[model samples]
Target chain A: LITDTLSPQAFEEALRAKGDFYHIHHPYHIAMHNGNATREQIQGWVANRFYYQTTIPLKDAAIMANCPDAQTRRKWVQRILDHDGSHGEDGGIEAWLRLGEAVGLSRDDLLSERHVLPGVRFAVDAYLNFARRACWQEAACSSLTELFAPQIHQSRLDSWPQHYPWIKEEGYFFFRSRLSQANRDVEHGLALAKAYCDSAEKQNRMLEILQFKLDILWSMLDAMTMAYALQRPPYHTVTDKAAWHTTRLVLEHH
Target chain B: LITDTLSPQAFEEALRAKGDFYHIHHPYHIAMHNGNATREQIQGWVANRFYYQTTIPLKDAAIMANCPDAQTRRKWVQRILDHDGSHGEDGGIEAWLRLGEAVGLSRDDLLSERHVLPGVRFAVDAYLNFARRACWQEAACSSLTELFAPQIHQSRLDSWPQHYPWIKEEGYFFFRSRLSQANRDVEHGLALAKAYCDSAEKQNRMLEILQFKLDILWSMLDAMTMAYALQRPPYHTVTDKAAWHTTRLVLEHH
Candidate 1:
């Protein structure tokens, strides 16, 4: 299908256009932004997406595992640092926990992953597995979805304070942080994609890879939409109680 | 949580009790059986579920990889063959393809995985990941969810022949096969769970693992319900033109 390889600029444009399918367009995102999301929907989004947040470092590690370039590794390691954080920085994950607390979820709830739906967990795991298995460049290219991440982070920053005033002011820190963070990430990811995917064949492959990544994001919300918005958790009709198995082994503590 | 260790028979009772959460009770399953499902619903169920059918062998392989005992391996290998097929058998995977055709999906659609929902894929992948990472006994115990599989398979056999005559008779083969095959399989799986989980702690852990398995099945239907039943796919509000991204990297072929 790719008869001609575009110049770097054209390829970048094509990739950037993929922002069309990003999670920002998902109804859940729309509901959250437009002030329509309920307390439960907001809480569920925060909880379900926390699974994605924690996996960021793991996905980055998988990228670095197959990455051979020290220069590239040096840049990518910062992503791990950004999410997992250093000795002084409590990290994005901690910010997420604060956000969770701000939304009324206990730290144990997030850590327990008891609130995380099977669909969201699976979607996040697929992202990690993609990073581990795909060649480093292809895997990193998938992160190009982060190119669209800034606007999503921005929407929450712009809209959440007005739409949901109950959220603690401090809970907004993660989104504010990503305002700059996703911009920087996209810069590196875009350069990698444009530089590495130069062939006609490779250019098209990169687009599909981006689509795959977009599907992952869209699908995460689709699961959330099913669970929180539509009231169809795993066994919604069969039982009102949580009938889920623990994702964690949880035996050593006992 | 472990109050006291129980005898193997008691542990078996604990495990069988989990059938209460099995998918047979799921509204989606009930709809199909009661003949309330439209043709589109039937088609979608088959399409979405083909993904799960194909992954069975992968999950089974993950189980065997962690399993070291020769006796167990010999018994488990048959599961792989039963799904993937041996020299003479078309296998359950093929049987499912026949099912898809009977429901109006093509082999390419099933193989393309384009019709598979992200939620279903995620739920199913979590099952495989659990199998790959869990200790062999834990993984084996998780498969004890099969103890309830007969009732589901038989429910279809009992109900479908009467309610839906449009389906090609061959499409019924997989369900019929699963009726007998699951019965035999559950016999082995139940025996393993009883023999291995003799401790109170072990019994509790196996129950949790079984719960995890049930969650996987229930979540798969949750996704299907959202898409086919609720008319909410990934982006239902923004567009209805199948705004979905392709699941496979088909540019590699082109």
Candidate 2:
């Protein structure tokens, strides 16, 4: 429906406006920020967020697969290293595992992902599939969710110590590490979006893409809210156990 | 891990055993059948389910696309016709629209799909995408959830009228029509599974595929439970409105 192209500055501003819809405002997040989340809720969030965290490299890899530009690929490959790390000594994913430990979930609990809700799995899988299929530019721009990520991480870093003191200090590394990493990622993502989304049609499409990314984040929290806050996981009436399928790829059966 | 092949009859029984995990046992569904669902709950279910109803033919078409056998395609085309109908007068999709009206939702309400939860959309999209990517036999076999569908239809037909008599009698046609159609579909899907899944590995794979399909249905109800039963739709605390993305294909931007 957009009939006129906005200036690059305007386009960038519009994308920033999307932050209003970012998941920092989701009720589950607000609950966590306000110290209203129980220990179970915190554990559930850490476990489920691990799924999203672990998938980050796969999504970045998909973007690199479709992209041909060497310069872009060079900068983009850093995202993989950021999460996967050199020799696995340190990485965002490892920090997340530390966060899981701090939240009282055993390494096996997060590694097994048995407690991850089906709703959360579906939402995160959607994001990975989107990255796999979308154009590199569009897929790359989707990472603009990180534009809003710094604040959420900072919110936790600033408040969690006072509110949930049981969370070990080392668990804060993920949030602190993301503070600068997210800002750098956003600078690259925003520039790529502004440069590529030059037409009205293209600009509108980029906005929709960003919104889709936001939906993924918000939808993850929706699932967490249903499970932890509402205490009504799938088939809760029929069984006390988590009845979701094992966290394996359906295609892996072959 | 399956080390021994079972007889075809045993394989069918194993597939049938999966019925224990079907969405019929979802709490939201149990509440509906037990006459405990509020008006909003029923209406919310119908609205979100319309999205699933409309996507069935696409999943079938993906199966047909992968299947090269004319005989299989001939039978598969009927599955599409059953949902889409010749000239669109008697199709299952049309009956669903009628269901929308009967449930106090306007036709536009169902068609707009704004009411469909992101969790539901992700789950259903996963099904369609699975069909597009998987072997036609495997994709076709995933439809074995229909093996358990008649009872759920009958559950609504038997209980909904007496519990919520305000529903127009015509709304029941979709459930009645599905009763036979699902039985017909199941016979073919079960036959395909038993014939193709002859080895232990294949049998185990088919079981996993069927389990994935069950997850889709159960996850759909999980989304409904979050939104309707628990009153915590996405962004519920920030806005009263459904804030999920517009139900357009993320790839359709080009």
Candidate 3:
């Protein structure tokens, strides 16, 4: 281990360097942005990505549950509002459902979560589990992946229209909505990461946590590739039926 | 929901019926027992199932953490010891590693967990998450799937040697270990399930939880099928590299 602690600026640089492993570089993502993705691939992406979008608030809530500082909670709570919405207004989750429709999937298709591969659900749920189990600051800092989110949102907003005009214009709202929100979230997240990771060990741990988050994103796309690009969803050989479980709560039965 | 609760015997019968959906019926599993599985398929199953084997104790600990009654906890802790062992004795997890070696995988290959698929990881992790978040009794009752485990273990022990004599005689230890242990564990789990699930609503919830557990096992086999039988691991179309993440902790760096 390094004996000397890096300066805050240096720590921030190390954190930013992790962006290279972001899912944007994933081939499934590259295929979509380059307009090489077939409609099935795009629909599969929308359906699977919807699982991640829906769970974002739960992950935020886990962080908030662990946080003791009201000041931090005040800022962190907005991330939940941004996804879950307030006072009947649409949030990012709803915006994603529209994207599903734009890609020709029914809201039921997205909401049912039947099409989501086990790989994506596990990756997204792993992040939520990490947030619940890790320290509040560590979990909060893991959100620093938002540092790279704006670029991905912008890439889709810029390319999807010219490359595939069939997508309804309303579906673009989620991406456009995130352009400013992600930056605001990043400021708070990066400040926490830099302020807390004062030691070399902390700095390295933070970087690994960021990579863990990035792996989650990349793994989600990897699941999409296996299911969509390669045409091999779970149990594809034995049966053509969708093999993933429903997200409905057990109590819903009554 | 039914207004009247079923008798304890009837409820036990209902719980046992869930066994019809156990993973022994998964097509991948069916293939393995029928001698249709290739070496790659068997190796892949051994590696991925090892991940589930490793997590069994963690899941049990979560239940113990939430449980208040010492009597239940005292009984429940044995499940952990069964998998983790005491006094340097081998446990099921170690027995699984030997199964790995018997199947031609290095001990490092099994311990490293690189071959474990994302689908299987998520399905297994979901069960762990359920244990951590749900009421301890509900989580404990979910283990009633062991009511079905002895048969599956018996099936493997009966067939594997005849189907593939290349597997070392030592590889059979894991299944032989489970045959007696599963029956013992089932007595505790089923007693708890029948005793705790007295109301109609709880009976229904308990049944759903059992199905949830079944879904996890079946889904694990589904993942194995996709990767080994169907030859479509994550990113299979993009590159041949293994895309799953390492299981090591972030702090292991220093």
Candidate 4:
């Protein structure tokens, strides 16, 4: 479980071969850029995405707990706070709240976690659990997605202003900040992976974790696409009558 | 503050013309239809959006508490319960969990609220506060975004499966449920606004509130666009290092 799943040479080669990040080419990006989405559609995506951003540090913390070395643990622990934020100011969650505000969801609404889908919770929880239970190598490997994040970040930076000029430069701070951060993180992870995993078995396991992480990322989108983008009602879709009725019941003093 | 604003005709017009009801031509849709994005970009958006999905009911509750009318308040209360789930067998939040599971976030991490951003907290808090403090008319007016939601929902239903086919039908339950729900809510809101706000002063206040709600929505996205889409750091940006350090300190002791 704590071994390299690929040859160091093969892993390095794979990293080098990832020429342009694929985020620029992702389906949702194309949709957003092409003017095919309505405000509601985009909001749906934003609303659901806020959940994942909220989970980043939690998962990171879980991984940090598994690190046997203090330095390694310390290095990873910082990211958790970064994602969660210090007491009340701006953290990833706060930034996400701003994003939610920009999109129309009230901060109160977003924080309540009242409308979240069942599947999303399960998925995020699963990731955190994985980090908590998996070996340090496997946990680190799961984050290999960071290797590809820079490309996505780059694409977003390039395309956003072109497609939506109404946005202020201040609104894009998250992406701008991540440009260097993602690069540094990915590089560090790559180097760490190389240094730690000295065996073929470990390399394979790392690769598997990467695949698993990718799948997690992909599945979340699949749910959003199905619910908001497609407008197909799954089992947990929120309805007005239901919402209204529920509100009426709760407001009554028992 | 409340008595000074009301316009019956303008309020009616506002109700009918609220942009939330209108079918907006957003950039995201355009990008997707034009083939400008890859699958991965969409996935990232979806993953991040999980936070919003989970918080919907929470937002509603914040507002539910503000409802002055028992029936109206009760009507809104059920929505939170639905998403949060009573017994935990299944609910909207659980469905979102399943979504996260499908995508790959850990259940433990997702539920912990550890990695969420400060902006998210602020935005969500603002929404709940807005609801809590809002006059009855204002609360109803804020929900008027439901007016524009149906058209957007319809457009999404029309185009989504064609553009992105990987989504499962079950995942769409949220959007699907909203279509009829949005329509009914919009109709109800219109009636409420029209009946209660008969004076120009009231109508003006309603309009202002509507604008404020839009700002809230717009700002959330603006924040997200800055952080996730633009890759820029928001004013409240949380560094990964800090996040890691804080988590290490807290969890290592545990």
DockQ of each: 0.54, 0.57, 0.27, 0.02
The DockQ leader among the candidates is: 2
**Candidate 2 segments whose C-alpha is farther than 4 A from its true place:** A1-3, B1-3
Q: How large a fraction of the reference contact set does each model reproduce? A: 0.62, 0.56, 0.20, 0.00
Q: For residues A1-254, could you state the per-residue lDDT of candidate 2 as single tens digits?
A: 46899999988888888788888888888888999889999998999999999899999999999999999999999999999887755888888998898888888998887887777888898898888888899889889989888888899998899999999888899999999999989889888888999999898878877777888888888878777887777767667887677645543554
From the highest lDDT down, the ranking of the candidates is 2, 1, 3, 4
C-alpha displacement of B239 in model 1, angstroms? 3.9
| CAPRI-style class, candidate 2 | medium
Residue-level lDDT for B127 in candidate 2: 91
lDDT of 1 by residue, A141-237 (tens): 8888878877788788889998789999989999889889888998898888888988998988788777767777877887787778877777777
Best by lDDT, which number? 2
Q: Which prediction has more favorable lDDT, 2 or 4?
A: 2
Question: Predicted candidate 1: interface RMSD?
Answer: 3.5
Q: What does the lDDT read for residue A99 in candidate 2?
A: 89
Query: Number of backbone collisions per candidate, in order?
Result: 0, 0, 0, 185
Superposed by TM-score, candidate 4 places the C-alpha of residue B1 at a distance from the truth, in angstroms, of: 34
Per-model chain A TM: 0.95, 0.97, 0.95, 0.81
Give me the displacement of residue A235 in model 3, in angstroms: 6.0
Per-residue lDDT of model 3, residues A66-159, tens digit only: 9999999999999999998885647889889989999899999998887877677777888888888888999998888899989999999989
Error of 1 at B99 (Å): 2.2
> Which stretches of candidate 4 lie above 4 Å from their native place?
A1-7, A15-26, A86-88, A166-169, A236-254, B1-254
